[PDB]
Amino acid sequence: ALRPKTLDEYIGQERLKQKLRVYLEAAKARKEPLEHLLLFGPPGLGKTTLAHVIAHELGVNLRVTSGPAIEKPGDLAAILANSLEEGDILFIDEIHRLSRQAEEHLYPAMEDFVMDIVIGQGPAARTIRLELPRFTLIGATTRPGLITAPLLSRFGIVEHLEYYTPEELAQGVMRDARLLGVRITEEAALEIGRRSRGTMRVAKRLFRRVRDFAQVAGEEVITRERALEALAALGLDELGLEKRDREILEVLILRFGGGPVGLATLATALSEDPGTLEEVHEPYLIRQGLLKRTPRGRVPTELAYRHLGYPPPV
Ligand SMILES: Nc1ncnc2[nH]cnc12
Ligand SMILES: [Mg+2]
Numbered sequence: 001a002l003r004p005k006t007l008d009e010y011i012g013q014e015r016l017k018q019k020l021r022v023y024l025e026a027a028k029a030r031k032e033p034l035e036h037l038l039l040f041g042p043p044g045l046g047k048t049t050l051a052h053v054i055a056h057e058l059g060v061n062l063r064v065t066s067g068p069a070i071e072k073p074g075d076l077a078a079i080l081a082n083s084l085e086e087g088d089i090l091f092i093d094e095i096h097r098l099s100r101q102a103e104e105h106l107y108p109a110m111e112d113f114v115m116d117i118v119i120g121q122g123p124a125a126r127t128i129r130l131e132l133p134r135f136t137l138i139g140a141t142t143r144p145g146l147i148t149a150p151l152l153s154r155f156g157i158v159e160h161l162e163y164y165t166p167e168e169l170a171q172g173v174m175r176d177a178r179l180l181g182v183r184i185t186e187e188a189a190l191e192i193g194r195r196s197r198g199t200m201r202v203a204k205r206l207f208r209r210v211r212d213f214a215q216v217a218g219e220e221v222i223t224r225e226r227a228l229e230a231l232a233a234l235g236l237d238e239l240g241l242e243k244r245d246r247e248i249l250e251v252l253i254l255r256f257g258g259g260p261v262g263l264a265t266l267a268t269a270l271s272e273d274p275g276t277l278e279e280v281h282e283p284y285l286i287r288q289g290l291l292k293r294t295p296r297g298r299v300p301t302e303l304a305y306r307h308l309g310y311p312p313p314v
Contacts, residue, residue, distance in 0.1 A: 002179075006056060033134050034058055041160065042161070043283070045161050062089045070099060071099070072102065084132075091137075096145070173207045192227055209230070210234075250308060263277060290303055290304040
């Protein structure tokens with residue numbers, strides 16, 4: 001599991017890299033106290049890596065953790081007070097979902113580098129105040145939504161990440177590929193990029209179902225056609241839709257004629273979990289302008305009909 005170290009080797013997010021570069025160098029010169037950065041990112045976008053970079057650039061250690069991971073305040077304290085020495089980075093991924101209390105503890109630490117703590121148990125216990133070193137916290141979010149209360153207030157830098165361009169993805173599919181033990185023409189990779197979903201995570205995660213299908217017989221090469229056959233066999237349209245996605249529109253279009261449906265009976269008749277439907281497939285579908293949510297129910301874009309090779313109605 002080797003990944004880019006330098007902010008340079010990082011494939012993508014130029015505006016962000018520049019914006020970061022500014023905050024770093026300015027701080028490597030000013031001081032290692034990099035303000036409390038907060039990366040916002042569309043759902044499913046690799047932020048950790050960048051954190052390792054931001055960490056490597058600053059030349060400090062990185063303690064990665066999820067929002068859920070922080071189970072009790074203790075865990076947060078035990079990290080800021082021990083694991084971390086001045087200048088290090090505590091990465092609270094998915095920071096939007098922290099423990100009500102765990103959060104309340106992050107406030108102080110982020111603001112004045114001092115966290116209190118409920119020592120002992122019952123009425124036979126007291127409260128101590130632990131002084132924390134100067135560290136920088138990087139919070140990442142899948143739900144940029146202000147679904148981050150005034151915890152937002154205590155942040156220095158607050159940037160966003162855009163999806164990755166098919167090329168950036170390919171550049172990554174190939175960069176990650178070749179060095180990994182498989183060889184594939186750029187056209188091939190880039191045909192996987194396009195198929196991916198702006199997500200690097202998915203980019204490499206798809207390539208995995210390609211390099212596992214084609215190079216089984218013929219080994220030394222994967223050309224577009226090769227990859228193509230692969231993607232093809234796997235059920236991937238030039239639009240990135242997985243076999244199922246298609247079917248969803250399919251049913252929408254045919255079963256309910258596309259007319260307002262209602263996640264309710266769609267998931268039901270579509271024989272699937274509403275949440276699954278709504279939480280897993282619908283997204284990309286809406287983003288690709290194929291599906292649309294309306295007060296009346298789920299409906300399919302013209303483009304849907306036009307994609308599934310139908311006559312966009314009336
Ligand atoms: N920026 C990036 N470059 C290469 N591989 C990555 N994996 C996740 N983010 C990446
Ligand atoms: Mg993580």
